[PDB]
Each structure stands twice: as structure tokens, then as C-alpha cells.
Design an enzyme around this catalytic site. Structure first.
Site, PDB file in Angstrom:
ATOM      1  N   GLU A 179     -54.385 -13.121 -26.237  1.00 21.61           N
ATOM      2  CA  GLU A 179     -53.217 -12.305 -25.989  1.00 21.61           C
ATOM      3  C   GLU A 179     -52.515 -11.812 -27.182  1.00 21.61           C
ATOM      4  O   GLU A 179     -51.984 -10.741 -27.149  1.00 21.61           O
ATOM      5  CB  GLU A 179     -52.198 -12.873 -25.005  1.00 21.61           C
ATOM      6  N   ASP A 207     -49.559  -1.909 -24.297  1.00 16.34           N
ATOM      7  CA  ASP A 207     -50.894  -2.426 -24.262  1.00 16.34           C
ATOM      8  C   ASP A 207     -51.938  -1.286 -24.389  1.00 16.34           C
ATOM      9  O   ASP A 207     -51.609  -0.141 -24.680  1.00 16.34           O
ATOM     10  CB  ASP A 207     -51.072  -3.335 -23.003  1.00 16.34           C
TER      11      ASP A 207
END
Ligand SMILES: [Cl-]
Ligand SMILES: [Cl-]
Length: 162
Positions: free
Chosen positions: A11, A20
Site C-alpha cells: 500500500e 491512486d
């Protein structure tokens, strides 16, 4: 290697909001703030998450808090799930770890496009499960990490995290 060490790797740690590969505002260890083009919305979301006026930055200790919840959140949805409980309960500690990773990353909703794989899985058809899995919007935006979760699901080991 555990679930936390595992997602942390996949992550990342970012103390400033970001988007993202999908373009969605995000912070900390993969914590989705808002699919919403508005940075402000994201900020306000951030503040609500944290319960204090952030202006987009947090402490990592803060990052780690969301991390706990999120992780908790995940496992809970699996376990809170008609379809998923049976699946998770069916697996080893490692393939379980991988299961959490996937849900955490994508969410329940998307998780269900994953039913035939999780099924094959139940048939021990790793390889097949595995090639299946790659054929996915998911695996497609983030191959490196999706390659890791799959290898994980497939082998019942941590080699990809080695
Ligand atoms: Cl283990
Ligand atoms: Cl793509």
C-alpha cells in the site's frame, strides 16, 4: 510476514492526500478518502476520518490508526458475509491473509466479480484460479501488487513478499 506488513508493502505510506492509479483521493496506507474530483471534499473527508482540521496532512501515527480500522473493516466484511465467510474459513492463514488484502484494496462489492476464482480456489485449482484472477480490471491497473497477491493465493506461501 503478516497482513499488516503485507498491505503496508503493497500500500505504501503517504502523509499527504493523493490519488491512486484510478485518480481517487487517498492518504496513508491505502485509505480511500473520496472518489470525488474535488480536493476539498477529500479534505473534509480527511478531517472527518481523523476528527480534526487537517488541510490534507496527517501524522503517520494517524496513518496507522486508519490502517487498523481499515484492516478491521476488511476482516469484518469478510466474516460478515454470506458468501465470503464460507470462503475465508475454508482457507489456510496465508491465503486468508491474501483474501484480506484483496477486500481491503477493492472492497466487497468488487470482490464478487471474483467468485469463480475463489470457487476454483475452493477446488484447489490454483493455477487456474490464478490465471483467472489476472484477467481483471484489478490485476490490470496494478500488476505488480496484484501479481504478488495472486502468487500468494496460489502458492500458499510468502515468497512474493521475500
Ligand atoms: Cl504464515
Ligand atoms: Cl489497464
Amino acid at each position: 510476514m503478516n497482513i499488516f506488513e503485507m498491505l503496508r508493502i503493497d500500500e505504501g505510506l503517504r502523509l499527504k492526500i493523493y490519488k491512486d492509479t484510478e485518480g481517487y483521493y487517498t492518504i496513508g496506507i491505502g485509505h480511500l478518502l473520496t472518489k470525488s474530483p474535488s480536493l476539498n471534499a477529500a479534505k473534509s473527508e480527511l478531517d472527518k476520518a481523523i476528527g480534526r482540521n487537517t488541510n490534507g496532512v496527517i501524522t503517520k501515527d494517524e496513518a496507522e490508526k486508519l490502517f487498523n480500522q481499515d484492516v478491521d473493516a476488511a476482516v469484518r466484511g469478510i466474516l460478515r458475509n454470506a458468501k465470503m465467510k464460507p470462503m475465508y474459513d475454508s482457507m489456510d492463514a496465508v491465503r486468508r491473509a491474501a483474501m484480506i488484502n484483496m477486500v481491503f484494496q477493492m472492497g466487497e462489492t468488487r470482490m464478487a466479480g471474483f467468485t469463480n476464482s475463489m470457487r476454483m480456489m475452493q477446488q484447489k485449482r490454483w493455477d487456474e484460479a490464478a490465471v483467472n484472477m489476472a484477467k481483471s480490471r484489478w490485476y490490470n491497473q496494478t500488476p505488480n501488487r496484484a501479481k504478488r497477491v495472486i502468487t500468494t493465493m496460489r502458492t500458499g506461501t510468502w515468497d512474493a513478499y521475500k
